[PDB]
Coordinates of C-alpha atoms in Angstrom, one line a residue:
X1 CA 94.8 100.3 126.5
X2 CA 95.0 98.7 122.7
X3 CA 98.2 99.6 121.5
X4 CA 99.1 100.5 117.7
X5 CA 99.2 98.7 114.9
X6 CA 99.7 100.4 111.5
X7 CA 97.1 99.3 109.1
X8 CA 99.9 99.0 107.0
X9 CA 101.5 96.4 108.8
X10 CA 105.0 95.6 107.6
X11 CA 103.9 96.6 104.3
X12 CA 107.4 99.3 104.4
X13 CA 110.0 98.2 106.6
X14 CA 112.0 96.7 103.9
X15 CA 114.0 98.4 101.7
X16 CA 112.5 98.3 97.9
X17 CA 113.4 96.6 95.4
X18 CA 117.0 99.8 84.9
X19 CA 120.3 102.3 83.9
X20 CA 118.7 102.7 80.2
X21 CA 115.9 104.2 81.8
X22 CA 118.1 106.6 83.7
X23 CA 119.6 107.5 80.8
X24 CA 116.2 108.5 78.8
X25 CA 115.2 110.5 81.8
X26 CA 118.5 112.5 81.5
X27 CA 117.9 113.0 78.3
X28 CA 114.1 113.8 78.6
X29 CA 114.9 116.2 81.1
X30 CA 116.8 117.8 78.7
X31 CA 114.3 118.1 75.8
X32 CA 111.9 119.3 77.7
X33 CA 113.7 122.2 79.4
X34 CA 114.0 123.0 75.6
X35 CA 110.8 123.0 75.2
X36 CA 110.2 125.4 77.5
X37 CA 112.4 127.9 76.7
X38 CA 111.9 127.3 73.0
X39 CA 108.9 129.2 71.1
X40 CA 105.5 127.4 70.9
X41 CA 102.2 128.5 68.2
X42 CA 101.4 131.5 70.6
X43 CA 101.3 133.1 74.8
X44 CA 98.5 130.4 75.3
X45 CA 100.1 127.5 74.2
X46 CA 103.4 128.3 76.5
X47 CA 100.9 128.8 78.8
X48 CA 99.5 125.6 78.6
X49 CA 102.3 123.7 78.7
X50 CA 103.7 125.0 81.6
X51 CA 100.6 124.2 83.4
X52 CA 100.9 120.9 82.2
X53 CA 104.7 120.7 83.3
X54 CA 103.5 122.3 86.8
X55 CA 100.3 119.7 86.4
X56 CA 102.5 116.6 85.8
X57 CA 104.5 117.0 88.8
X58 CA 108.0 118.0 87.6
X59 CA 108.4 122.0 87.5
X60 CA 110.7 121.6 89.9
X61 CA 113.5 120.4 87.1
X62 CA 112.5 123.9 86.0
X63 CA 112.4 126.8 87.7
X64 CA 114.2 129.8 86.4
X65 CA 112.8 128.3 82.9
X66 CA 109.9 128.6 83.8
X67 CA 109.9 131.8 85.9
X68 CA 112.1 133.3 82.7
X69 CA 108.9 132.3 80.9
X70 CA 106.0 133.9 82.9
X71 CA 108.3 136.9 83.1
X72 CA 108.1 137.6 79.4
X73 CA 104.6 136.9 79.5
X74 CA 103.8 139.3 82.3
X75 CA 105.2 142.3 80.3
X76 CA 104.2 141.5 77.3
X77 CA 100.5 141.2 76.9
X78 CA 97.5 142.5 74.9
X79 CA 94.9 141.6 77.2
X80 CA 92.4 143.0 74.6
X81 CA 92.5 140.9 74.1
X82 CA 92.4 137.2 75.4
X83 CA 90.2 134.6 75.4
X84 CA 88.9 133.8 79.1
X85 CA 90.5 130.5 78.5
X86 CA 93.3 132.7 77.9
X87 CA 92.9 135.5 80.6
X88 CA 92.2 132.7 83.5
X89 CA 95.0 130.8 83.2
X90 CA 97.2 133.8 82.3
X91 CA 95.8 135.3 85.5
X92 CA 96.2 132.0 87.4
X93 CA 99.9 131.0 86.5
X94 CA 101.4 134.5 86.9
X95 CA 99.4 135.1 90.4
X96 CA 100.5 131.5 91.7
X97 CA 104.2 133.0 91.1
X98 CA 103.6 136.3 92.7
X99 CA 103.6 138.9 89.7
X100 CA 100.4 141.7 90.6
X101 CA 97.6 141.3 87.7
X102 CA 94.6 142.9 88.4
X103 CA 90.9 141.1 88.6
X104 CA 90.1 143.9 86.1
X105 CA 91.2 141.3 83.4
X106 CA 88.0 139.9 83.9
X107 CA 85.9 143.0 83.2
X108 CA 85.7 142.7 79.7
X109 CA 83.7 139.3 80.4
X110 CA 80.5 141.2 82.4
X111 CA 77.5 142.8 80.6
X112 CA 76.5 146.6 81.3
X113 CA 74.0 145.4 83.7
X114 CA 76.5 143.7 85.4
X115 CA 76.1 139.9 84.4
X116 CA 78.9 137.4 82.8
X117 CA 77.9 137.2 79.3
X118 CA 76.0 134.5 78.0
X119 CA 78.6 133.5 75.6
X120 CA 80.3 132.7 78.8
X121 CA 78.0 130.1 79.6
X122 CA 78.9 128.1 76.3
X123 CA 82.8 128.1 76.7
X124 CA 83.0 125.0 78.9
X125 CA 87.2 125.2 78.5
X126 CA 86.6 129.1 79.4
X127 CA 84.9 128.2 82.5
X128 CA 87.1 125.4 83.6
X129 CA 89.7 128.0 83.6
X130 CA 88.2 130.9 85.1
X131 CA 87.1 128.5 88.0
X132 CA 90.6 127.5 88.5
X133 CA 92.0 131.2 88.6
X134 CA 89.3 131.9 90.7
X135 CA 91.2 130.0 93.6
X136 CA 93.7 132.8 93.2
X137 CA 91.5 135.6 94.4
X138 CA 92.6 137.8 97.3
X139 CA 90.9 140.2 99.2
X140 CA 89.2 143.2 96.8
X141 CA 88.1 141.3 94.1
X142 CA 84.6 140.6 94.0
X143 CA 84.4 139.2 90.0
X144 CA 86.3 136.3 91.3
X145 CA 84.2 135.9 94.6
X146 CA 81.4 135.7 91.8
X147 CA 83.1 133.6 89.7
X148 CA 83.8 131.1 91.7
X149 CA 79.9 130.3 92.6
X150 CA 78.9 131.3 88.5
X151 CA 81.3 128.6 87.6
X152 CA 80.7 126.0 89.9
X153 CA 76.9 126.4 88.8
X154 CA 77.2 125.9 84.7
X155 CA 80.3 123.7 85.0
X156 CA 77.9 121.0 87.1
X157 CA 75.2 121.2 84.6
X158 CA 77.7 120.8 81.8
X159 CA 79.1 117.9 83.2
X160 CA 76.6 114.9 81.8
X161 CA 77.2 116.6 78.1
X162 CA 81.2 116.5 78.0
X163 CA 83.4 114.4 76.3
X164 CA 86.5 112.7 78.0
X165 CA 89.1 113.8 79.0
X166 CA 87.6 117.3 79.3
X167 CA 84.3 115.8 81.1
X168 CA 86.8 114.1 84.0
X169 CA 89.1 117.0 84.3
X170 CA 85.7 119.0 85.0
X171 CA 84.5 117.0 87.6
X172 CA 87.8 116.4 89.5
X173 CA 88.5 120.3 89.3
X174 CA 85.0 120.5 91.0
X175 CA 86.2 117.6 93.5
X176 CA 89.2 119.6 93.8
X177 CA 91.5 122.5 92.3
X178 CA 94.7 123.0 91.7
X179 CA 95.6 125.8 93.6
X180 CA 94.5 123.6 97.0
X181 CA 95.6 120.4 96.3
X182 CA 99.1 118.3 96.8
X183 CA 101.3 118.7 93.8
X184 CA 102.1 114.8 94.0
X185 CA 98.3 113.9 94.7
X186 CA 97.2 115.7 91.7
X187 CA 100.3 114.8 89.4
X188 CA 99.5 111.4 89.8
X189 CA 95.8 112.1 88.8
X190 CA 96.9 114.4 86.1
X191 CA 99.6 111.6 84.7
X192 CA 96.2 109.1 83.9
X193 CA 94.1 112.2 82.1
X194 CA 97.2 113.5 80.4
X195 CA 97.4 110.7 78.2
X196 CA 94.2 111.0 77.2
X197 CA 94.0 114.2 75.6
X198 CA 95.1 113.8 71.9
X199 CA 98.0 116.5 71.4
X200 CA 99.4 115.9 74.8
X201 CA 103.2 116.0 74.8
X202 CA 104.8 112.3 75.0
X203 CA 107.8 113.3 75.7
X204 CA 107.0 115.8 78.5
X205 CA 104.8 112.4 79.5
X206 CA 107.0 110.2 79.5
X207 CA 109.5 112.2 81.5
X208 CA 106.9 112.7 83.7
X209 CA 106.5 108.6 84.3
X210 CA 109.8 107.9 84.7
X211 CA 110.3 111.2 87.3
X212 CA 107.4 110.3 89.5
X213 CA 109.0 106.0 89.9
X214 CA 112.5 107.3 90.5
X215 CA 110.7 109.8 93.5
X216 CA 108.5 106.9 94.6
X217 CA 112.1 104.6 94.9
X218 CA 113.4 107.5 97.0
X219 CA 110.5 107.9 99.6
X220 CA 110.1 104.4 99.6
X221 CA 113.7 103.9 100.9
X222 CA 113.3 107.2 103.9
X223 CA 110.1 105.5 104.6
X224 CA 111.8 102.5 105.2
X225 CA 114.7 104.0 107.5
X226 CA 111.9 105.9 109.7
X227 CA 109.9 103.1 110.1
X228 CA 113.0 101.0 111.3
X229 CA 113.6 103.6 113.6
X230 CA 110.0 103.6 114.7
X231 CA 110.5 99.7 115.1
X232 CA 113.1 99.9 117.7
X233 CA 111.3 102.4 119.6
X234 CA 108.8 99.3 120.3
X235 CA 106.2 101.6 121.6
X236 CA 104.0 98.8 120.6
X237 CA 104.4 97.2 123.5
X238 CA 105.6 100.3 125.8
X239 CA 102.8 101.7 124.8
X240 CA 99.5 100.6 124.9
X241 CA 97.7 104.5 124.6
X242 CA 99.7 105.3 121.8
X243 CA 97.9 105.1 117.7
X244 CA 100.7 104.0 114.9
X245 CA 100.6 106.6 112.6
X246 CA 104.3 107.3 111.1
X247 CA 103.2 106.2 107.5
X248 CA 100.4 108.6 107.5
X249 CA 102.7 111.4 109.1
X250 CA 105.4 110.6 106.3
X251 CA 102.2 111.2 104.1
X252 CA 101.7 114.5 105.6
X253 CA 105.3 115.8 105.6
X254 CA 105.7 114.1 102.0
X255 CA 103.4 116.5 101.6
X256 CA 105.4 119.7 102.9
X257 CA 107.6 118.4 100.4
X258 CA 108.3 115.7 98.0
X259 CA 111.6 116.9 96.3
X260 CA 114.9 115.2 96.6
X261 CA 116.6 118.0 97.6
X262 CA 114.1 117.3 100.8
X263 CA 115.1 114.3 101.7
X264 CA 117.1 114.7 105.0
X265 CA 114.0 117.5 106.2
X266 CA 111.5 114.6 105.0
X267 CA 113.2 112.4 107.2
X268 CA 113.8 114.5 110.5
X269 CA 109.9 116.0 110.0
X270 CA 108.7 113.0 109.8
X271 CA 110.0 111.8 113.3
X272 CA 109.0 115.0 114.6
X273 CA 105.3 114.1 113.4
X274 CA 105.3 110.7 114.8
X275 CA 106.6 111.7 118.2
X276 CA 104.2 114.6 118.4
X277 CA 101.6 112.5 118.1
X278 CA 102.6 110.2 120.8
X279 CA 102.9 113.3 122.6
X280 CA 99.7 114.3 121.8
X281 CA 97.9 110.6 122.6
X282 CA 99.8 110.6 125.9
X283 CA 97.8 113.6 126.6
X284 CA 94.7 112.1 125.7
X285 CA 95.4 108.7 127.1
X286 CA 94.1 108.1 130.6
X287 CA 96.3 109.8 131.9
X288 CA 95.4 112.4 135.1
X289 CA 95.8 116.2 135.0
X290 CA 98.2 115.4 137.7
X291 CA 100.2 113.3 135.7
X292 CA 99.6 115.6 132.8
X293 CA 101.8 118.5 134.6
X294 CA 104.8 117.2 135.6
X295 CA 105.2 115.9 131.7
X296 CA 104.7 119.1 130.4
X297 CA 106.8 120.9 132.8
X298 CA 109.5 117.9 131.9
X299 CA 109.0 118.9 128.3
X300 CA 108.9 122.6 128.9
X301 CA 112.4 122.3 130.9
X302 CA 113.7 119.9 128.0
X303 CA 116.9 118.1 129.6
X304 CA 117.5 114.1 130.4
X305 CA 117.5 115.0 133.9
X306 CA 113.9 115.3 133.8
X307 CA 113.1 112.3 132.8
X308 CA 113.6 111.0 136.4
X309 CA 110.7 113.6 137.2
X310 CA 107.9 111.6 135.5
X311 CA 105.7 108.5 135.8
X312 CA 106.9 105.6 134.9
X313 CA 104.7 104.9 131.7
X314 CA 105.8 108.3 130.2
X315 CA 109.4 107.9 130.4
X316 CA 109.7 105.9 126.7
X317 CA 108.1 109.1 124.9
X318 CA 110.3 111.9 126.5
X319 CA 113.3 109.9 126.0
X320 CA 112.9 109.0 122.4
X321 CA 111.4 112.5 122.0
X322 CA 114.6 114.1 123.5
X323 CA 116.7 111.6 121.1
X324 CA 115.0 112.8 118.0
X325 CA 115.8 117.0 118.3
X326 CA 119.4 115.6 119.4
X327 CA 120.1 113.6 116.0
X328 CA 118.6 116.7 114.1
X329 CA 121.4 118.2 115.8
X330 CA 123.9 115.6 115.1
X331 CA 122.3 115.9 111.0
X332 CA 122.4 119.4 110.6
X333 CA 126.0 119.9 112.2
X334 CA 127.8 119.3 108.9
X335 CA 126.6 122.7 107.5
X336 CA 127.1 124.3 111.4
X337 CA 122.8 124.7 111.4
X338 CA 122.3 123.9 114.5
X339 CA 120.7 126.8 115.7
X340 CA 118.0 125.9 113.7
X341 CA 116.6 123.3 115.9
X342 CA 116.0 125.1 119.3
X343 CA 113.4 127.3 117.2
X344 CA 111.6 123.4 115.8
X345 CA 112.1 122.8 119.9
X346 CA 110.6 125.7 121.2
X347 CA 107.9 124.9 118.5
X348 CA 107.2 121.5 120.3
X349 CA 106.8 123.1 123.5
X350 CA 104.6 125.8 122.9
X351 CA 102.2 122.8 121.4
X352 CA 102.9 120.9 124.5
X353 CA 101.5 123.8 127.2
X354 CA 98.1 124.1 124.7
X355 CA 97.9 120.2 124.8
X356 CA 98.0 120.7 129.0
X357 CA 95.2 123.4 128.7
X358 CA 93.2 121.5 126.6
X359 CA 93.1 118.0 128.7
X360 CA 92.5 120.2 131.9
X361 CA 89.2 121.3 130.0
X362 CA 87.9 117.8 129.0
X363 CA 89.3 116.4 132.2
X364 CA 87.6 118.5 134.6
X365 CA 84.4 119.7 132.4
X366 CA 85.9 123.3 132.2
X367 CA 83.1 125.0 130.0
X368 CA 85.4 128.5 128.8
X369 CA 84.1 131.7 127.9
X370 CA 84.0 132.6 124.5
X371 CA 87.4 134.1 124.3
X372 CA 88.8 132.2 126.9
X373 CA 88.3 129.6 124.3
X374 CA 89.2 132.1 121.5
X375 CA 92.7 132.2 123.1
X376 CA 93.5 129.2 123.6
X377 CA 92.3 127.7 120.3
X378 CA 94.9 128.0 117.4
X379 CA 97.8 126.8 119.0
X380 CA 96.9 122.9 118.9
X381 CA 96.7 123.0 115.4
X382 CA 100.8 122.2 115.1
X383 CA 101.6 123.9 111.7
X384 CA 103.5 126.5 113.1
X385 CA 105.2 123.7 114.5
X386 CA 105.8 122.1 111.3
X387 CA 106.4 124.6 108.9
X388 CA 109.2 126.0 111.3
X389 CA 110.5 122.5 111.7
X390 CA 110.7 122.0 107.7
X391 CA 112.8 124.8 107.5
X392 CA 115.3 122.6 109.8
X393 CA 116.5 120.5 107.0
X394 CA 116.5 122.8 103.8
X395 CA 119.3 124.4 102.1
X396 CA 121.1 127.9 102.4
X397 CA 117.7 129.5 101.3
X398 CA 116.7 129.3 105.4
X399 CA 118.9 131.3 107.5
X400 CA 118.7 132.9 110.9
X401 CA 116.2 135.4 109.9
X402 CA 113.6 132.7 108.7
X403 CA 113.7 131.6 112.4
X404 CA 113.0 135.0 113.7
X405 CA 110.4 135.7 111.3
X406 CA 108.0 132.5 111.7
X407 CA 108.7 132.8 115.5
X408 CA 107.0 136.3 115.0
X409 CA 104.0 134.4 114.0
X410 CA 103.6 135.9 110.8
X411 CA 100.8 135.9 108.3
X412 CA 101.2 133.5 106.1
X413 CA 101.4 130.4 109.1
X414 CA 98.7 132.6 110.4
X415 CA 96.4 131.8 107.6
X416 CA 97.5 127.8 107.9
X417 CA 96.4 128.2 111.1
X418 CA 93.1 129.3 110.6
X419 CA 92.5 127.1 108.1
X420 CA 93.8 123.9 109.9
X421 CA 91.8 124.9 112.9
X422 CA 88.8 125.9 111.4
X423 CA 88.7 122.8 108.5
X424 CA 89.7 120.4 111.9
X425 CA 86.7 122.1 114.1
X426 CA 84.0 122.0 111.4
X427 CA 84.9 118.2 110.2
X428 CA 84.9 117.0 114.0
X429 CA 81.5 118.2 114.3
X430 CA 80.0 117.3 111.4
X431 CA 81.4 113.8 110.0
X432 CA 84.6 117.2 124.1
X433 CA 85.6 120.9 123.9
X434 CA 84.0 121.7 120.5
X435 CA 84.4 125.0 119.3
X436 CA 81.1 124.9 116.8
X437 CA 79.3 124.0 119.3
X438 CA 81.0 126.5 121.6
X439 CA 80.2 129.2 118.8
X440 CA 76.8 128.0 118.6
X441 CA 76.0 128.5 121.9
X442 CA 77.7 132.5 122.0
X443 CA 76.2 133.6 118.9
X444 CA 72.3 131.4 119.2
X445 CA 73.0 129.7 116.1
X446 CA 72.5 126.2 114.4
X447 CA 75.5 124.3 113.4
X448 CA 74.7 124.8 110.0
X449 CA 75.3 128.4 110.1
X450 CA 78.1 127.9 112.5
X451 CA 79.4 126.1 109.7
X452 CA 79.2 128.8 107.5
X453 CA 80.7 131.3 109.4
X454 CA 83.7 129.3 110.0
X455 CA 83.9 128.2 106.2
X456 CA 84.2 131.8 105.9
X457 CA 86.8 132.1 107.9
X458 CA 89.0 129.5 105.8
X459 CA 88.0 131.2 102.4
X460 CA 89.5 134.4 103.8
X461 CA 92.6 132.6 105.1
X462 CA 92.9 130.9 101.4
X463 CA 92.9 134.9 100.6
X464 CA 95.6 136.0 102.7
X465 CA 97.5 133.3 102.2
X466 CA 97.8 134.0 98.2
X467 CA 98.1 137.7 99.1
X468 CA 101.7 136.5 101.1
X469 CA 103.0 134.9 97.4
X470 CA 102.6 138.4 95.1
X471 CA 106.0 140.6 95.5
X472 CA 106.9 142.0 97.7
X473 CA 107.3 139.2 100.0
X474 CA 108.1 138.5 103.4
X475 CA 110.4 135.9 102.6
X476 CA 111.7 133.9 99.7
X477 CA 108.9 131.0 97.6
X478 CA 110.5 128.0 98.9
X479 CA 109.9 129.1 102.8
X480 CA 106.2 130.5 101.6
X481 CA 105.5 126.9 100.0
X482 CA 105.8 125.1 103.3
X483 CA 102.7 126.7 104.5
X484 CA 100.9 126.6 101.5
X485 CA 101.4 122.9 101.4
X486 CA 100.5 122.3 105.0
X487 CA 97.1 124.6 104.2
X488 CA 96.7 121.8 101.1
X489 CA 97.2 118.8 103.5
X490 CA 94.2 120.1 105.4
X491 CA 92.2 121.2 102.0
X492 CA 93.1 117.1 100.6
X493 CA 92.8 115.4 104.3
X494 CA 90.4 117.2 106.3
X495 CA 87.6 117.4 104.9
X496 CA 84.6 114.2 105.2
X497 CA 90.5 105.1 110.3
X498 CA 92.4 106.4 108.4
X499 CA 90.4 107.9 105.7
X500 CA 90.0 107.1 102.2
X501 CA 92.1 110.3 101.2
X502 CA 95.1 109.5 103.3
X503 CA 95.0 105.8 102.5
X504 CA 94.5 106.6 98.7
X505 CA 97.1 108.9 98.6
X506 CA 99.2 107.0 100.6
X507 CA 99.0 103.7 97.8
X508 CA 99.2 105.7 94.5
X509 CA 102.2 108.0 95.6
X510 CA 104.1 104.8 97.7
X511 CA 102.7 101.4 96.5
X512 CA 101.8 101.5 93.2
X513 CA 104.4 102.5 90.0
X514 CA 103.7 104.0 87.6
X515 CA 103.7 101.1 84.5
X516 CA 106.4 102.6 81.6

């Protein structure tokens, strides 16, 4: 009934717009590959650096480097022993890339009666670290279920003392950790305290700089195709229901992933996004549970044919949603991967019959039972939908199996699930069909303790999901890291229009450069 617009207006349809530079950045690259293969003072410095390489946003130059790196480390260790600078972020990097340390590292730290020792208390750096490494924890390890609330407690009362940068890369880690927030979102942060912090590395710096313009020049130019695309579709004035929110969906999938090698998924995704939420506004438009059928059966039968089958005002979505899983099609043919996208379809349909089931209970007042509710929950969330769409455009790593594997609803989307459900349910509430108050009302609770159950729920999903990254695993990093970074949208988006996170993230990583 008020169509549109983008807050961002115009601000991206254009396409944007130094070879020295590139040169220095080929170089840089080099050096600091060197640097990381090369020796440093000792363990904890190479440590630190490849945090800080992680940190700054451009690991991905480095892989088997750095993997060749924590490998050495992970054999070769004295852990009596380490600092608990040292432990923590030993524990932390070699956990984030799958290798099995124990929580037992941390035993040395407790007191016979059971307490972390007091000298503890005074090792700001030490706690910084162990609160970080405590977002690694997985089911079992109750020193890190402590530590998490022991550090949380000193490291606030520390804060007013501190000395910069160490004082802001305290209260941001508080804000937000590392383990749960978007690389890019956090390099950016990390590329203003880096400087700072006398010793820092200027050429891993200003590699760094130069890496995260030439990444902004790329998205900016995708963002600029989609939103052409999205232009033509003129749903602005075809539909007056529908929310423009492709620059915020880029966001998200930029998001699933920001690396060039991405580009064509970024690109396909992002579509997907945008056309799911059409989809999803259509269905909570005014339209009639009447109406609502006969477009889900139209989706659910997927075919041009159908479109004849459909009132009027829907016909613009279900054709350009049909024309967007044909030019994945069309994309993806080159490198005969076709059969990837009738899994992202199938995807899109199974969200489609949950939408149906949902508008029938708002529509007619349907109050469910507790399970009824319970089963028909999860799948609205749409990462399953996602993730398995992201695997559309990647490489040779994805392969038939991959589709028959996250079709099998396995863990690891599992625990995005839960946590983009239960993040989604709690924030709606606080900041129709409401599933807190739906639990409240089951169990005779307030929505404060509602709240913390379901909290609870997403700190054991956090759990299971890093159980999925230490080896064995189910399948390879790259296809794991699609559901760890849709887990991290929701941990930077989705918790407090279109919010000061999205619109934040969305001018640092797109609008603003970096200034050389």
């Amino acid at each position: 009934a008020d169509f549109q617009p983008s807050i961002w207006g115009d601000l991206f349809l254009n396409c944007p717009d130094d070879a020295e530079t590139e040169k220095r950045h080929q170089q840089l690259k080099e050096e600091v590959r060197k640097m990381i293969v090369a020796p440093m003072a000792n363990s904890t410095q190479k440590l630190a650096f490849i945090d800080s390489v992680q940190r700054l946003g451009v690991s991905y130059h480095f892989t088997k480097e750095i993997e060749d790196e924590l490998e050495n480390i992970y054999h070769n260790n004295n852990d009596a022993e380490n600092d608990l600078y040292t432990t923590s972020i030993r524990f932390r990097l070699l956990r984030e890339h799958g290798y099995n340390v124990s929580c037992d590292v941390f035993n040395k730290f407790k007191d016979e009666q059971g307490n972390f020792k007091s000298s503890v208390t005074s090792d700001v750096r030490g706690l910084l670290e162990l609160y970080q490494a405590s977002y690694l924890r997985v089911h079992g390890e109750d020193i890190l279920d402590e530590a998490i609330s022991f550090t949380t407690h000193h490291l606030s009362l520390a804060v007013a003392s501190l000395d910069h940068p160490l004082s802001e890369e305290v209260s941001h880690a508080l804000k937000q950790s590392i383990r749960r927030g978007l690389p890019r979102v956090e390099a950016r942060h990390y590329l203003s305290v880096y400087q700072d912090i006398e010793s820092h590395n200027k050429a891993l710096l200003e590699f760094a700089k130069i890496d995260f313009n030439m990444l902004q020049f790329l998205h900016r130019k995708e963002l600029s195709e989609i939103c052409r695309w999205w232009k033509d579709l003129d749903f602005q004035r075809k539909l007056p229901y529908a929310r423009d929110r492709v620059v915020e969906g880029y966001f998200w999938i930029s998001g699933v992933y920001f690396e060039p090698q991405y580009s064509l998924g970024r690109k396909m995704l992002t579509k997907v996004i945008a056309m799911a939420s059409i989809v999803d506004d259509t269905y909570d438009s005014y339209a009639t549970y009447e109406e609502l059928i006969p477009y889900t059966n139209a989706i659910e039968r997927w075919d041009i044919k159908c479109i004849d089958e459909i009132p009027e005002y829907m016909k613009p979505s279900y054709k350009a949603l049909l024309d967007v899983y044909e030019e994945m099609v069309q994309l993806v043919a080159e490198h005969g991967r076709q059969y990837r996208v009738e899994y992202a379809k199938n995807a899109m349909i199974r969200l489609a019959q949950s939408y149906l089931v949902e508008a029938k209970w708002t529509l007619q007042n349907y109050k469910p039972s507790f399970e009824e509710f319970k089963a028909n929950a999860l799948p609205t969330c749409g990462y399953a939908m996602l993730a398995i769409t992201s695997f559309v455009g990647m490489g040779d790593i994805v392969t038939p199996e991959t589709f028959k594997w996250a079709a099998s609803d396995p863990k690891i989307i599992q625990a995005s699930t839960i946590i983009c459900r239960f993040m989604d349910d709690v924030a709606e509430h606080k900041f129709d069909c409401s599933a807190i108050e739906c639990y409240m009302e089951e169990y005779g609770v307030t929505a404060q303790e509602a709240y913390d159950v379901f909290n609870k729920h997403v700190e054991s999903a956090w759990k299971d999901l890093n159980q999925e990254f230490l080896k064995p695993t189910e399948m390879p990093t790259e296809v794991l890291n699609r559901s760890l970074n849709l887990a991290r949208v929701m941990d930077v988006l989705y918790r407090e229009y279109v919010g000061k996170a999205a619109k934040g993230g969305i001018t640092s990583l797109l609008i603003e450069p970096i200034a050389l």
